[PDB]
Structures are given as C-alpha cells and as structure tokens.
Amino acid sequence: EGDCYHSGGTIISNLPFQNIDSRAVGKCPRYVKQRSLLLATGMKNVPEI
C-alpha cells in the first residue's frame, strides 16, 4: 500500500523530506537537495574523561 510515485518505483516514508525524484507525484513529502539530514532523538554527549 502506498501514496507516492515516480518513474522508478514507490516512495514510502513518514519523513517530511526526500531526496529521490523531483517529479514524484501524489500525497508526498517535499523534495530536498541534501541527501540526508539527521535529527537527534537524544541529548548532548560528553565522552567520559
């Protein structure tokens, strides 16, 4: 089951962005230029001394 397509198959994702096909059409996440962007689901990290 899907709701977004382009000429090379289907884009299934909960994410708001995608770097795949600008001519992707349907109920889609937005197209973006960078290949990947990381959102931290954690706190800062201080490597133990």
Partner: protein, 170 residues
Amino acid sequence: FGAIAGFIENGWEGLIDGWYGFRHQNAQGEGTAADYKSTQSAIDQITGKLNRLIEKTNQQFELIDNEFNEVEKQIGNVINWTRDSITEVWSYNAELLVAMENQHTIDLADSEMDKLYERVKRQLRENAEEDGTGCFEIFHKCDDDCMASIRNNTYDHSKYREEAMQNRIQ
C-alpha cells in the same frame, strides 16, 4: 545553560536506565542510581517533535511533465524553473527546520539539568555546599537510606539541620 559540557566534566556511560541519574558516596560505598522524572520529561519532548513532522499532507498534485513523449521546450524551462526553485525552498527549510529542531533539542538537556540541580539545592537547603565539578559536599552523615529520601523528594531539611550547620562552619 552550562550544565552539560560546562561545569559537569562529563556523563556517565553506565547509566542505561535513564538519560539522567544519581551517583553518591558515604561510609558505605558508591552506587549509580537514576531519576525517572528528569529522564522522562526529556523523552516526552524528543518524541513530541517526532509526532509533528510525521503529520503529512492531504493535498495531492498531478504529473505535469513527460519523460516519454516530451512536452514543449519554452515551457520545460519554466516548469523546470518553478520546480527547481521549490526544490531550493524545501531544501532551505529542511536546512532550517532540521537545523533548528536539533539546535533546540540539546538545550532541553541543560534546562532539565539546571532544574534537577537547583532543586536538590533547595531540599538540602542550608545543609550542604557546592564544590566545583557539580556535586554537593555533605558534611554530615547520610547513608543509603538517607540519600533515597532526597531522591524521591521526602527529605526533610529541619531533620538534619543542626548537624551540617555545625560541621560546615567548623
């Protein structure tokens, strides 16, 4: 705020069971505890941001070009102008929304760290002083059963009030 990577020198890789934890010492030994609220309130925020961006849209859009039987050229350089400029916008907001929601995420760890530190600073009241690395120097006797009363916020300040005001000034 200065907490994480400020005046605390570092974090504790042994604390599996929280983001935030306790670690004490007395005439018994040393033990690594955890704090549920301070860990849990922070978990509530990281996954709140998460449940936002999952909200997708109910606006559908049609294939307007053609990569088999190609359309006209004076129009391709206009659609490839609007689309290649929408590409440059959401590549700007993902540059800004993703860059910000991460910027705003680490600071929810220094305000949840000055919120657990200025509270134990108020249960103990006038019974302990702060040394430098982020601890409360206790000058009275407080064992395994006494520490756990500061943990669950049932510690009473007038319960050990006269001992530490006699071993701190001396």
